[PDB]
Write a protein that holds these residues in place. Structure first.
Motif, PDB file in Angstrom:
ATOM      1  N   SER A 173    -108.530 -18.950  20.804  1.00 25.99           N
ATOM      2  CA  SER A 173    -109.498 -17.814  21.014  1.00 25.99           C
ATOM      3  C   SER A 173    -109.333 -16.654  20.102  1.00 25.99           C
ATOM      4  CB  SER A 173    -108.923 -17.288  22.340  1.00 25.99           C
ATOM      5  OG  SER A 173    -108.609 -18.541  23.150  1.00 25.99           O
ATOM      6  N   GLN A 206    -111.365 -17.390  16.997  1.00 23.01           N
ATOM      7  CA  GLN A 206    -112.470 -17.300  17.309  1.00 23.01           C
ATOM      8  C   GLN A 206    -113.119 -15.542  17.142  1.00 23.01           C
ATOM      9  OE1 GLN A 206    -114.233 -19.708  20.676  1.00 23.01           O
ATOM     10  NE2 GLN A 206    -116.049 -18.811  20.345  1.00 23.01           N
ATOM     11  N   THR A 212    -115.896 -18.655  13.641  1.00 25.91           N
ATOM     12  CA  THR A 212    -116.913 -19.183  14.668  1.00 25.91           C
ATOM     13  C   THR A 212    -117.115 -20.516  14.735  1.00 25.91           C
ATOM     14  OG1 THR A 212    -118.763 -18.236  13.441  1.00 25.91           O
ATOM     15  CG2 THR A 212    -117.796 -16.869  14.884  1.00 25.91           C
ATOM     16  N   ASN A 220    -116.866 -24.166  15.043  1.00 21.06           N
ATOM     17  CA  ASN A 220    -115.869 -24.917  15.919  1.00 21.06           C
ATOM     18  C   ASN A 220    -115.061 -25.912  15.162  1.00 21.06           C
ATOM     19  OD1 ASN A 220    -116.891 -23.909  18.305  1.00 21.06           O
ATOM     20  ND2 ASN A 220    -118.714 -25.364  18.334  1.00 21.06           N
ATOM     21  N   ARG A 264    -112.614 -23.947  12.696  1.00 20.04           N
ATOM     22  CA  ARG A 264    -111.578 -23.490  13.864  1.00 20.04           C
ATOM     23  C   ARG A 264    -110.554 -24.418  14.173  1.00 20.04           C
ATOM     24  NH1 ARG A 264    -114.651 -21.619  16.837  1.00 20.04           N
ATOM     25  NH2 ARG A 264    -114.452 -22.994  18.722  1.00 20.04           N
TER      26      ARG A 264
END
Lengths: 75, 86
Positions: free
Chosen positions: B46, B49, B54, B56, B59
């Protein structure tokens, strides 16, 4: 004294013992009158609202609260 | 091999370049958010993010590196502590 009892002035005295880079946030904690109970309950979103936008800094404060919480309850 | 808890933001960016080198566009988020070793040990998916990762897949790749470094850190510290005993 349990941390949940600390006054805003006691929270500020605690913060003054933390990392040099967090001292800039003290004015905001003072303005908002963060009490000991509020500090034990503090979240990432509350820190963001108190002006702590750098996530590295949020994590240092949260690390210190977690340590204070463990001490408070003698874990 | 300096322990992660002692890493400065500089040590974090060196780490990032070595392991997350293919994702060099997020390197400066770690500088901007002042991610030291101590923060690196706490952040979550989180946080990444919120910091601005951003995408996926990007990340998840970074997150996998973070978890890998945390495991490495934990193991090496156990090994170190055993040498000092107690």
């Amino acid at each position: 004294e349990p941390v949940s009892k600390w006054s805003p002035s006691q929270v500020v005295d605690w913060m003054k013992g933390l990392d040099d880079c967090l001292q800039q946030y003290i004015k905001n904690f003072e303005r908002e009158k963060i009490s000991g109970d509020q500090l034990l309950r503090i979240t990432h979103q509350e820190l963001e609202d108190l002006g702590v936008s750098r996530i590295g800094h949020q994590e240092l404060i949260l690390e210190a609260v977690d340590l204070l919480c463990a001490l408070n309850y003698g874990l | 091999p300096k322990a992660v808890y002692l890493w400065t933001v500089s040590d974090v960016l060196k780490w990032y370049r070595r392991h997350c080198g293919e994702y060099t566009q997020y390197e400066q988020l770690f500088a901007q958010h002042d991610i030291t070793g101590r923060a690196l040990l706490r952040i979550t998916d989180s946080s990444l993010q919120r910091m601005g990762v951003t995408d996926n897949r990007d990340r998840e790749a970074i997150w996998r590196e973070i978890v890998k470094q945390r495991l490495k850190t934990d193991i090496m510290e156990i090994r170190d502590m055993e040498r000092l005993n107690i």
